[PDB]
Design a protein around this ligand. Structure first.
Ligand code: HEM
Ligand code: HEM
Ligand code: HEM
Ligand code: HEM
Ligand SMILES: [Zn+2]
Ligand SMILES: [Zn+2]
Ligand SMILES: [Zn+2]
Ligand SMILES: [Zn+2]
Ligand SMILES: [Zn+2]
Ligand SMILES: [Zn+2]
Ligand SMILES: [Zn+2]
Ligand SMILES: [Zn+2]
Lengths: 106, 106, 106, 106
């Protein structure tokens, strides 16, 4: 899927988690976020279209997805353990990862 | 790319790291491995074609890619720091992640 | 060292990173933070003095240290790579880990 | 506790996991391993007694403990999720982390 679609999937599922009642909802939304982050991995953002695929900027861009993927990984373990409140909290915190990338590259 | 193509990319680049001379070679191979791992994320393996996309098996299958992605991440920092030998060691160690998934799912 | 002393070491070094000029300063402060977090690992906080060492709360308390140790780990690689600004950014972000544990257990 | 004691703790509990029947035994042993790894963090090994505390060797020494702590972290989530077999597998795999540090510094 395209970068915009993966970003919409990320945005929509984060909102789902905030509103969620049970573990199943949170688990499913995180799984979907994990897929979208991984699918966005090798995307070239408009701001970096002129840059080398192995430029410091693109390396830093990719690092941001590593960080997001890693945060979703832990949030899902928390949701798998029945720790729904803590998983929702982890989901809120990973917005800073979104924001940090967006500030530089969006 | 298809699962088999991504597995060959993983295989080929791990061999490149083993025989590598300098940091640039190791860095480039690891980046290529990271892209292949990420692109393999949502693949359904032959052995699990009958299974639910959100079965315990498929979640366990995806978990294995989380571990590989995470390992490649650290190895790349080591190579970025000029710690070539330790990056090569890290690449050798992550073979156990390849092996563990293969045993269960290949 | 005691929990309070490890907490002051964490606080003091985080402020050092914010005001830091070069990589060496950031590297040193993060190393000191890493040692303090690790030394804090087996501490029992006043709020959990009556709880079992293997209670859900103590397990969750320790989990917070795992997250902090992990975050410090990645920030140090960034500082090791000369990526000072992104290391400082990473240090800012991990304040959420401090805050999340404090909210529950301080 | 001293380095030798922490290494004995790591060794004894790894053996406990191998022989374990249920989740609770695996969970408790991993938690004990996590405590020992964290307590070993700032130890100076006999082989590096003459080295600077911030030499490449001591940074590499400490990095090995980050790796072990991270591996125990994941294994405990697996045991927490009732995935005992997988947790036991994960505990076997982290022996390579023990071995890799020993080869260099023991
Ligand atoms: C869960 C956290 C995230 C959320 C909620 C999120 C959400 C969004 C949204 C709603 C957009 C606008 C889509 C559009 O352009 O129509 C966007 C764009 C973008 N995001 Fe994210 N995102 C997240 C994570 C990230 C990360 C980690 C990165 C960097 C690695 C990133 C990089 C970008 C870039 C470069 C764009 C601009 C794409 C364009 O202009 O077409 N995002 N994001
Ligand atoms: C860096 C580590 C890895 C390496 C070096 C590697 C290498 C390979 C190779 C050479 C193949 C044979 C495909 C071919 O004929 O071209 C393969 C297949 C396969 N691997 Fe991996 N792999 C790794 C990681 C993983 C992981 C982490 C998983 C599971 C999460 C996985 C699951 C599979 C599956 C299901 C196949 C069968 C593909 C098919 O024949 O349709 N692999 N891998
Ligand atoms: C870099 C991250 C952190 C910073 C900068 C920080 C800072 C502080 C500070 C300044 C104090 C005041 C207590 C004193 O020293 O007199 C404190 C107390 C405390 N912190 Fe942290 N903290 C951090 C992370 C954490 C984490 C991760 C946990 C738990 C996992 C935690 C648990 C506590 C508890 C329980 C107290 C109360 C201890 C007492 O009252 O004796 N903190 N922290
Ligand atoms: C689960 C993994 C590990 C196990 C089972 C383990 C076990 C042991 C044991 C049984 C010893 C002998 C204790 C003695 O000196 O009488 C030892 C020594 C030692 N280990 Fe490990 N260890 C592990 C992880 C590590 C790691 C990751 C490092 C490096 C960061 C490390 C560094 C050392 C060093 C430097 C010694 C020599 C200490 C001395 O001679 O006083 N160990 N280990
Ligand atoms: Zn747009
Ligand atoms: Zn669209
Ligand atoms: Zn965790
Ligand atoms: Zn590392
Ligand atoms: Zn990183
Ligand atoms: Zn000895
Ligand atoms: Zn002793
Ligand atoms: Zn995991």
């Amino acid at each position: 899927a395209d970068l915009e679609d993966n970003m919409e999937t990320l945005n929509d599922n984060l909102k789902v988690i905030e509103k969620a009642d049970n573990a199943a909802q949170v688990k499913d939304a995180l799984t979907k976020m994990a897929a979208a982050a991984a699918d966005a991995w090798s995307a070239t953002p408009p701001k970096l279209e002129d840059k080398s695929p192995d430029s410091p900027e693109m390396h830093d861009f990719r690092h941001g997805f590593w960080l997001l993927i890693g945060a979703i990984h832990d949030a899902l373990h928390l949701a798998n353990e029945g720790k729904v409140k803590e998983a929702q909290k982890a989901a809120e915190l990973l917005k800073a990862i979104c924001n940090a990338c967006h500030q530089k590259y969006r």
